[PDB]
Amino acid sequence: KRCLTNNDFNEFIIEYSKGLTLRRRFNQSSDASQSLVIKRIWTQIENLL
Amino acid sequence: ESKEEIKTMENIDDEVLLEILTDINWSIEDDADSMIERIDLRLAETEYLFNQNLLSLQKIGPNIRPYEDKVNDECHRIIPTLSLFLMEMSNFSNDIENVESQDNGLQVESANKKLLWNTLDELLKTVSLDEISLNQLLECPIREKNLPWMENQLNLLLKAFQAIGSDGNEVEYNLREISGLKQRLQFYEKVTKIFLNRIVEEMQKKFSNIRGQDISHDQMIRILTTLLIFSPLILFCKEISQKSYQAIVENWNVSIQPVYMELWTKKISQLQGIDTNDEKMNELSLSQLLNEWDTFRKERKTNDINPVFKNSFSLLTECLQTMRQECIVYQNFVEVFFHISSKHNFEEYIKHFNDPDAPPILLDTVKVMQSDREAAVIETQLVSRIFQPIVTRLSSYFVELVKAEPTVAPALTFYLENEIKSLESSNHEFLLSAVTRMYTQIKQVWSDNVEEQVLHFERISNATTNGEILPGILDLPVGLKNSEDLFQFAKRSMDIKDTDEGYESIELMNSSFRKLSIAATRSITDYMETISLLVNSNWLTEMLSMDGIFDTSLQNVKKVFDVEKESYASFLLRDTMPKLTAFVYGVSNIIENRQNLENILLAYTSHEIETLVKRLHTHMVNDFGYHQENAINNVLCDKLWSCIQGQTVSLYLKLYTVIDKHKNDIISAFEE
């Protein structure tokens, strides 16, 4: 919802996937086999694209 | 930016996916976390409900079990008499032993087989220590012919475990004081080399099992290869001395489950093929009720094209491939360790008996296993968007519910997941189509009534036409949702219970909630909507409601009571009296298989509404003359004067209509 809103702020993509890139590195400091968290940063990836 | 932890297999992913598969992890929700709290309270009342259900009630059901179980305490109460009988014979006879051998007693003077030999009677500890036949009679092995590593070096490793390596001396006895320093350290050093040999034979032979993908799927090379692993798990020292042989059966098969699990994962999800739009088959279950009954049926039972196994194929395939995730994983109950039991010295009995079935086979155990997640979620999540099912698939998904009673496998939990393919398969059970019947009886009343605002008259000038669609050709799917509930649903059966029906109360909401949805058709109760109403209800109630399996009978005579009450209102300016009520009021529906002239689409002979209003107002209202006409005919006087020869007393009776609203001699006696 932040994405289409403003820029996404850009911080609502930039800082939002910064402080979410924290927990997207919960999904990257190990992954096995958190298809939940993999689905999380998966949709983060598709939205960022 | 604040890079978080190493998410490597925490307290989640143990079906926390399937936990979050309540509704969706589709954005996101903490609202759905509250929904999880609601399902948690639902389980709380279902489990307190199970608690007081079983707390005195089915704890007396457990006393109803104690018929058989206190009966086992009754033959076992003869075992109390056999146990006090043998314990009384040996109690008094052993007291006779206490006075008999111990005449002096003085056991060093009366029973000195062990008082001369306080340690010398326990002098059979000469098999110390190591390590000749530990690695000579097993190179890696010398086995596979009930040979010296099966018959002897195995049992020599049982002598490595007969040697209690930490019960060394008790130095007044001193059997293995320094012999126990390297007895099973060289027997478990050489058998640590045989242990790494069977570990490399486990990753190697199980990588050959990963190459073994014989016939849909089948890992038969892993079955004959599993015959080459029963000796490794029998191997009684014991066999996993430090949880290692089972780690060659499980932690080695950890990645080698995912070769079979990845195999079924990419395998089973590829059978996708479907239709597009089947109004033809609803014209075959609309053509069924046309030439029925009233004729020879029509349907056969006809289609029901879903009865062709587009998804019922997996009911014997992905329940069988699910029975590879379960029942050939219950042939991984021939490969868990196997079945570690039993050989006992150390490969003696399984040197002979190393041939399991294993599946399935009964139920008396307690165990746990894995390797059934993605085949189950693949079978159900594949079967998800299935909106025609499970109406015709009532006994299919309920046979799936009642699939596995008597095994000791998790196929019951699969059958409970296949009950979840009936029950957590959501309200389909589709009574939200009744919400589409009232919600689309109100928010779609701006199209059907847009031709039918005046429907049964012409004051607001509209034709009596609205339509019965939803559920018009869904009444055709009552014969198509009911026809394939006896062939397709019956050919989806299994063990206890599973059709065996016995089941399919869905399929009784095809009576109950179909007369509730048909009560929304009673809330949908125009004269092509009265005509389509009773024609749609009786388009289900000509064959499907007598086989008499429905409950919309009073709905059919209720909407058909609105067809009598609104077809003699649409013809309330026409019949009057019976001159349009037989061939022009009900036969605007009977031969159909503004409402003054608007029954002229079929307009069954004779005296239709195109002549009952015109050729009765054209020198016929009084008579051809005036009281009365010289015509009792069947061509044009049926609109004019045979109508008057069918409504003769209805002249004065119709003139009496002004005799209450706003004496009777000069009209009702001498009407000419």
Swiss-Prot record, chain A:
It comes from the Eukaryota. The exocyst complex is composed of SEC3, SEC5, SEC6, SEC8, SEC10, SEC15, EXO70 and EXO84. Component of the exocyst complex involved in the docking of exocytic vesicles with fusion sites on the plasma membrane. Present with 3400 molecules/cell in log phase SD medium. Belongs to the SEC5 family. This is Exocyst complex component SEC5. It comes from Saccharomyces cerevisiae (strain ATCC 204508 / S288c). The lineage of its organism: Eukaryota, Fungi, Dikarya, Ascomycota, Saccharomycotina. The gene is SEC5. The chain holds residues 244 to 292 of 971 of the full protein.
UniProtKB/Swiss-Prot annotation, chain B:
One of its GO terms (molecular function) is small GTPase binding. It comes from the Eukaryota. GO terms for biological process: endoplasmic reticulum inheritance; exocyst assembly; exocyst localization; exocytosis; Golgi to plasma membrane transport; protein transport; vesicle docking involved in exocytosis. Disulfide bonds: none annotated. One of its GO terms (cellular component) is incipient cellular bud site. Belongs to the SEC3 family. The exocyst complex is composed of SEC3, SEC5, SEC6, SEC8, SEC10, SEC15, EXO70 and EXO84. This is Exocyst complex component SEC3. It comes from Saccharomyces cerevisiae (strain ATCC 204508 / S288c) (Baker's yeast). The lineage of its organism: Eukaryota, Fungi, Dikarya, Ascomycota, Saccharomycotina. The chain holds residues 611 to 1332 of 1336 of the full protein.
